Assembly symmetry: D2
Homo-oligomer: 115 residues x 4
């Protein structure tokens, strides 16, 4: 429950369901290593990506596959995906919610970080 | 200028053109009195709303007619309009740009205040 | 549970707690009548504003008192409040979540509407 | 231009000045190759990144160094940078403006594509 991703559809005003999400962690060699992945639920939320144990300090990238989402709705969107890159757990364990609000030519993303 | 309004469309990735914008100033009896208005240009901008002489300190409301905009495009909108309420404060020479980025179920607005 | 308001702080990445929220409904005479009010909880959410019975079809305005919020944190923000105006229940009862993400000079608002 | 990047600061309500921006183009081996870069101007804009002749169809990544920007202002940021990944498509004469509105824990980005 240390990492949750939530995705909303700004065109319909609904959760964005079945959106693929891939998480990567920067490795010693400076490459992006696969870390976890999943798909948003009917609530637009993706829980269970990781555990407190596995979610160590590091630089992480959360890639939200927005293009596939929009194309499945008949929209040709601008972005390939939405990417969120951040250092995590540098001051000890935290809980992170990464939210993205999606439109065809735009998105917003915010993080809520709690102890 | 001392006041400009800019409106963008997040669905098509373009300026929002011909959007009605109304500006009001708060009167002593607490009511909103018409102050200025117009329609956004081909660039999505509305210039020439007021002059330095007219734009005195006070509380202003900028109402952007987002519902009509979405109606013209055949897209079902949530909001009646977008409203931005702010106090104009003299603090050296300032220009206010009110920008709004529109989606059918969401909008973002920011103020850019520069000398 | 037909109306919920959620407010997030984009400066700290946390829920916006104890934020005053006032809801109004447009009356026959075209004036804004008080409808409900409350303050966000530790989760940044405001539940229990109304009931399915009281929340009839109409035009509603949700005013989020952002200025008071920011001033309590030592910030002099741009907006007086964030206003969200929308027609509700025109096609029958729905559940509405109105979210606002706050920064000193900017905000975004989105609605998630479910049946 | 065919490509412009604009960055705004939602905390102070101003252009984000002297922000580093790097543009990459996806190569055949799937790697990101440097394409163009610069620092935003006093208007928060970065012009002259590329020419029509150089800006061929392909996948591009625009990375805005938001962390350094927030560091210079003494404000604790969440993201390492903001990233915008998109496919450039020839479809009549197009100009791309990538805009980003920055907060310490959130950002919004939109594309404005015009002839
Ligand atoms: O969590 N939210 O409900 C919410 C609201 C507005 C927003 O702009 C965002 N965002 O940028 O991710 C998220
Ligand atoms: O440039 N702008 O005017 C502007 C306004 C609001 C926004 O949310 C954005 N954005 O997403 O980058 C840009």
């Amino acid at each position: 429950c240390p990492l949750m991703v939530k995705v909303l559809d700004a065109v319909r005003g609904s959760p964005a369901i079945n959106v693929a999400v891939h998480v990567f962690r920067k490795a010693a060699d400076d490459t992006w290593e696969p870390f976890a992945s999943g798909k948003t639920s009917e609530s637009g939320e993706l829980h269970g990506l990781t555990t407190e144990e596995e979610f160590v300090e590091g630089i992480y990238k959360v890639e939200i596959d927005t293009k596939s989402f929009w194309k499945a709705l008949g929209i040709s969107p601008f972005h390939e995906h939405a990417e969120v890159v951040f250092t995590a757990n540098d001051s000890g364990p935290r809980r992170y919610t990464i939210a993205a609000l999606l439109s065809p030519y735009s998105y917003s993303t915010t993080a809520v970080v709690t102890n």
